[PDB]
Coordinates of C-alpha atoms and ligand atoms in Angstrom, one line a residue:
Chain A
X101 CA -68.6 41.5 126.5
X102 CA -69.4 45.1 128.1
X103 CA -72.5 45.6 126.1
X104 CA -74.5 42.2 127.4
X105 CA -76.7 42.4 129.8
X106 CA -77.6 41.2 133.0
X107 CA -80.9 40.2 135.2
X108 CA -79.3 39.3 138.8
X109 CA -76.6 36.8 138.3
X110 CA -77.7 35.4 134.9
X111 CA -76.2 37.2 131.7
X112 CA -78.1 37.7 128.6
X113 CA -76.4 36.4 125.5
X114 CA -78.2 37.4 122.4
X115 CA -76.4 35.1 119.6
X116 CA -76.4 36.0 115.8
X117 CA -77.5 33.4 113.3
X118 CA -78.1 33.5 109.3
X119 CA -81.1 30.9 110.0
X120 CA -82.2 28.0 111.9
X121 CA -80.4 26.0 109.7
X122 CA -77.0 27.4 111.2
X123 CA -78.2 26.2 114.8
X124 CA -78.3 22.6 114.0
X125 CA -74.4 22.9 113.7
X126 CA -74.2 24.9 116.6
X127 CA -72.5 22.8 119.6
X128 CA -73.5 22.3 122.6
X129 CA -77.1 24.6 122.3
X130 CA -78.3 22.3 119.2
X131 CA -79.0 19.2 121.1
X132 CA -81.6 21.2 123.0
X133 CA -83.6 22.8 120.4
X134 CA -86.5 21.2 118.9
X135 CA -86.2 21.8 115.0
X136 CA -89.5 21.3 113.8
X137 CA -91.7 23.5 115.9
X138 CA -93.2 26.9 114.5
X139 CA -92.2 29.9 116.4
X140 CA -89.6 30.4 119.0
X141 CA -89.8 28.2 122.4
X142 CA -88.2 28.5 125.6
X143 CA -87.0 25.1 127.8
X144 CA -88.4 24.9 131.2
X145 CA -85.5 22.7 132.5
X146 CA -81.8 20.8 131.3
X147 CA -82.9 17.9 128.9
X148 CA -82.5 17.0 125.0
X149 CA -85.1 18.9 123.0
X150 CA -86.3 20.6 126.0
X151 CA -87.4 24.0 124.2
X152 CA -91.1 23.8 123.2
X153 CA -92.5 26.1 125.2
X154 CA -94.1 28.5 123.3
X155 CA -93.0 32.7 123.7
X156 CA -95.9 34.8 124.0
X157 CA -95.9 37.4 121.3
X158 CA -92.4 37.3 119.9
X159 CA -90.6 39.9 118.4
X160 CA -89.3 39.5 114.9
X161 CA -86.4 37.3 114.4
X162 CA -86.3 35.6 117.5
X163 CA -85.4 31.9 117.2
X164 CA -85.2 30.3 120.9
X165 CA -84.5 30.8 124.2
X166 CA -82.2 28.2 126.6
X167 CA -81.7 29.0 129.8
X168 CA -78.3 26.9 130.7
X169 CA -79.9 25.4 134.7
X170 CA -82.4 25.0 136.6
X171 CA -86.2 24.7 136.2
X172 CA -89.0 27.4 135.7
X173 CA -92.4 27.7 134.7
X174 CA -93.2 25.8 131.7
X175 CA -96.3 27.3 129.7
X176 CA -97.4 28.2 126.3
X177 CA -98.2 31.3 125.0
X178 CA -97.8 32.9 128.4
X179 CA -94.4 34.2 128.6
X180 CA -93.2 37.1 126.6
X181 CA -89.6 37.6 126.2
X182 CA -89.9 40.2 129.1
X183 CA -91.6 38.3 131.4
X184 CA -88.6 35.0 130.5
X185 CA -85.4 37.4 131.1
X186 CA -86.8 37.7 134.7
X187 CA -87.2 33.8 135.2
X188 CA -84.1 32.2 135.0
X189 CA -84.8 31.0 138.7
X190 CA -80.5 30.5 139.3
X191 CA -79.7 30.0 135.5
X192 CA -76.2 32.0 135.0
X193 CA -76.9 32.5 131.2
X194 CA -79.7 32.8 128.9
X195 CA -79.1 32.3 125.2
X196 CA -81.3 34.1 123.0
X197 CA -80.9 33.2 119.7
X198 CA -81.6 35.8 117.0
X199 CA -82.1 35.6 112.9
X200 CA -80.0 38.1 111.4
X201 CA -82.4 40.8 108.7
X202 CA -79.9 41.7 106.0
X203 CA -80.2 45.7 106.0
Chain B
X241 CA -95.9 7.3 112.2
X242 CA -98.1 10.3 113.7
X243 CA -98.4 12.0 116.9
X244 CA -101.7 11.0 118.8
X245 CA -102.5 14.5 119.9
X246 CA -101.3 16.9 117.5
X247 CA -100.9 14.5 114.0
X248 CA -97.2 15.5 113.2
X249 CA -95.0 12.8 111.5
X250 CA -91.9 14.6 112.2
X251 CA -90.3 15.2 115.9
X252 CA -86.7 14.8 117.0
X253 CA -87.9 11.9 119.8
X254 CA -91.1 9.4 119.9
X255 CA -92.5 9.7 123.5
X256 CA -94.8 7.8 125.5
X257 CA -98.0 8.9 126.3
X258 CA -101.7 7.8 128.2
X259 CA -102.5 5.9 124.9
X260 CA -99.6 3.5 124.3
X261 CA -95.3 3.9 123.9
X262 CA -93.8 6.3 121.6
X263 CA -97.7 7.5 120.7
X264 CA -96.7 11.8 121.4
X265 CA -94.4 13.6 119.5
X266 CA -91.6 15.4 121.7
X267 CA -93.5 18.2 122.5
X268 CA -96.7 16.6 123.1
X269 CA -95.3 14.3 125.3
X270 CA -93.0 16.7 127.0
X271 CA -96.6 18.7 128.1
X272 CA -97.8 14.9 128.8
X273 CA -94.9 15.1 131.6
X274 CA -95.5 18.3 132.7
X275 CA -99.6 17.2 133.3
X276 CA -98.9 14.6 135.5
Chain C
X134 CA -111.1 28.3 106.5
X135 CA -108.0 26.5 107.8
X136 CA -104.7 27.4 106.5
X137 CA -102.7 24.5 108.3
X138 CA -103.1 25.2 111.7
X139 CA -104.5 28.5 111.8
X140 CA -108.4 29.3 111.4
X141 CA -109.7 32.3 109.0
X142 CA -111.9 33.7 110.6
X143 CA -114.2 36.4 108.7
X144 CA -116.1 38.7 110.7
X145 CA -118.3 40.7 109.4
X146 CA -119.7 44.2 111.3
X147 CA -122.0 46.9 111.4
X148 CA -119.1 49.7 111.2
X149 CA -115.5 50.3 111.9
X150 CA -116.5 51.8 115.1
X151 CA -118.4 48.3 115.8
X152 CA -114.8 47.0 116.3
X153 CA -114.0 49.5 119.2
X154 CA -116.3 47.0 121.4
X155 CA -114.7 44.3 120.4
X156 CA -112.0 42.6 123.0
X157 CA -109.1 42.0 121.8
X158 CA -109.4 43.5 118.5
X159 CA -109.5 47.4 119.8
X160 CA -106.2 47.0 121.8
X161 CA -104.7 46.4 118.1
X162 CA -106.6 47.8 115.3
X163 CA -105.4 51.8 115.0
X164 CA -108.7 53.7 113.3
X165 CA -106.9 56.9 113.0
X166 CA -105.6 55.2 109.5
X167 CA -106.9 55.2 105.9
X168 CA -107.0 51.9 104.5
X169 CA -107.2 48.3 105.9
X170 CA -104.2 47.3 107.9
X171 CA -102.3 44.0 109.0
X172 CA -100.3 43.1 112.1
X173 CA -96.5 42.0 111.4
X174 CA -96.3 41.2 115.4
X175 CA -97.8 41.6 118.6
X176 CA -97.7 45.0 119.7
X177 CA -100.0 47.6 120.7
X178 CA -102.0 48.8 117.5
X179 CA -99.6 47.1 115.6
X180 CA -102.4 46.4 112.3
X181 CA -100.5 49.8 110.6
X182 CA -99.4 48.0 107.3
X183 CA -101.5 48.7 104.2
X184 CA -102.9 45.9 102.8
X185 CA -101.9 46.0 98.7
X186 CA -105.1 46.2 96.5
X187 CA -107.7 45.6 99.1
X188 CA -111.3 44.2 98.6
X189 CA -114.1 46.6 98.7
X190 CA -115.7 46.5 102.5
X191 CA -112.2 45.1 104.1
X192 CA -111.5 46.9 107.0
X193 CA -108.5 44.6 108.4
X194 CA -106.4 41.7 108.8
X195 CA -105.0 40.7 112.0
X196 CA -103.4 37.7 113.1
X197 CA -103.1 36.7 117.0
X198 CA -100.2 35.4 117.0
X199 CA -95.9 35.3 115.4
X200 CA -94.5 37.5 113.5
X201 CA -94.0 37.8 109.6
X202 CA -93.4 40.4 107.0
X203 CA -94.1 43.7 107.6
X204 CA -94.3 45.9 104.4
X205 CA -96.9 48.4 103.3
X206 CA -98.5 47.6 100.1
X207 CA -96.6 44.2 99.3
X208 CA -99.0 41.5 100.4
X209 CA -102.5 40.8 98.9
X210 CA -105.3 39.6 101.5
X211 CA -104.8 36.2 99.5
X212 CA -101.0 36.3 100.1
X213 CA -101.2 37.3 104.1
X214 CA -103.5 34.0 104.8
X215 CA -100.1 32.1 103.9
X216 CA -98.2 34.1 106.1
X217 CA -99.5 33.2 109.3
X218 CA -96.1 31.8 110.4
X219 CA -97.8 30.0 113.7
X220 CA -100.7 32.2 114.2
X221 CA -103.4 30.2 115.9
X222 CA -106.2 32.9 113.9
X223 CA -106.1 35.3 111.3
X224 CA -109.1 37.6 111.9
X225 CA -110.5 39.4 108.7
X226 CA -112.9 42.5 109.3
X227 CA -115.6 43.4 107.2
X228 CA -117.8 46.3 107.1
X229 CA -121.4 44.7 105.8
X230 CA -123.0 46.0 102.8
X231 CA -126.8 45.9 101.6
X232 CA -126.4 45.3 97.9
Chain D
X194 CA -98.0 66.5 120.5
X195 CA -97.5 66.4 116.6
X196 CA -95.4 63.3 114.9
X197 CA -92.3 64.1 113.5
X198 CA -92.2 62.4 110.4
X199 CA -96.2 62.6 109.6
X200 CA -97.6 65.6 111.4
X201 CA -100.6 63.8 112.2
X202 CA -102.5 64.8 116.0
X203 CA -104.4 61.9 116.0
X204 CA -102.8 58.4 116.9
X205 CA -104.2 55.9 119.9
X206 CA -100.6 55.9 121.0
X207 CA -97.6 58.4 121.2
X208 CA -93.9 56.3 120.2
X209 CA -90.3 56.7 120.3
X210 CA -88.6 57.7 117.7
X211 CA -85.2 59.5 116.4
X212 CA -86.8 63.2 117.6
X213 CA -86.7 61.6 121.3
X214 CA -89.4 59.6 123.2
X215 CA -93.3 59.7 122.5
X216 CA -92.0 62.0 119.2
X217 CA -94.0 59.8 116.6
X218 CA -97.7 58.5 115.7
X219 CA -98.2 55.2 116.2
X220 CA -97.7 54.2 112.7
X221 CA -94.6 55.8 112.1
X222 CA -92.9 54.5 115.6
X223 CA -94.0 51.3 114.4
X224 CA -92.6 51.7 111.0
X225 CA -89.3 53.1 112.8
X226 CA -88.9 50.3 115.2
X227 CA -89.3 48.2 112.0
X228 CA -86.3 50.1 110.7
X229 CA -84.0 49.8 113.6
X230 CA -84.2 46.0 112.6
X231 CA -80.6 44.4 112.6
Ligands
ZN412 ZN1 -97.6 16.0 118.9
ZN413 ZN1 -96.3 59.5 112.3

């Protein structure tokens, strides 16, 4: 709780996860995931499988990124993480979902 | 059945698309949306 | 020539300093180091990872897109065109030779 | 500007690293950021 972050009204929650696999189970983010894409994607509005949107030059074990309202622009390989935590556009979270590397 | 565009077989929703119903994956035919 | 999705694309130049010309490949290849180099991400001069058992006249790998394992002298040239994880190109330098 | 963990003077970019900011080549800030991986 004190250690998240936050870009104007919208916090960043940066969730832990074993593997994709994990998210399927995950309600209520799952239902907006699209499971069979390559390479973490972003949802330019609210709607069932709405992240496809492909991150521009993602770091390592980043899975996805769902902001929880509004709309924003929706573009491939355009929009780094960077540029996304600065577009939420009224969204009061963004979930970014991570892939945990065993140390 | 395959997606007109890109070729997958496997997507969470058949969409429509310019060709015919249920003819894009979902992200094909989500970008379908987006371009008019 | 096409692993799934993503194109090989083997380029083949006068020198290593040829590549300093070259848009984008300068903003990423780092020619202070010994050794052809990979890219595990996008970063700038991110192709630092040594290649294991390189090819005579390979100068580097680097792929324009994703992320994947980043190890120094793990992965063959034959093992990174598998690891393209989304990639759209893996670009792999040569310096020519006269035979 | 030397790097900390190499001693090299010759990198196209100066990184972060445990020394403090632009501390290591660019190879070894890369190979640290790799490390701070969790
Ligand atoms: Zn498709
Ligand atoms: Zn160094």
């Amino acid at each position: 709780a004190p250690h998240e972050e936050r870009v104007g009204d919208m916090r960043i929650v940066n969730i832990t996860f074993s593997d994709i696999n994990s998210i399927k189970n995950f309600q209520p983010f799952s239902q907006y995931f699209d499971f069979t894409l390559t390479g973490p994607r972003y949802n330019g509005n609210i709607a069932q499988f709405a992240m496809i949107w492909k991150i521009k030059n993602p770091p390592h074990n980043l899975l996805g990124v769902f902001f929880d309202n509004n709309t924003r622009d929706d573009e491939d390989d355009k929009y780094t993480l960077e540029e996304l935590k600065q577009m939420g556009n009224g969204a009061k979270n963004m979930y970014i979902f991570w892939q945990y590397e065993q140390k | 059945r395959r997606c007109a565009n890109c070729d997958t077989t496997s997507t969470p929703l058949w969409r429509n698309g310019p060709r015919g119903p249920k003819s894009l994956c979902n992200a094909c035919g989500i970008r379908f949306k987006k371009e008019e």
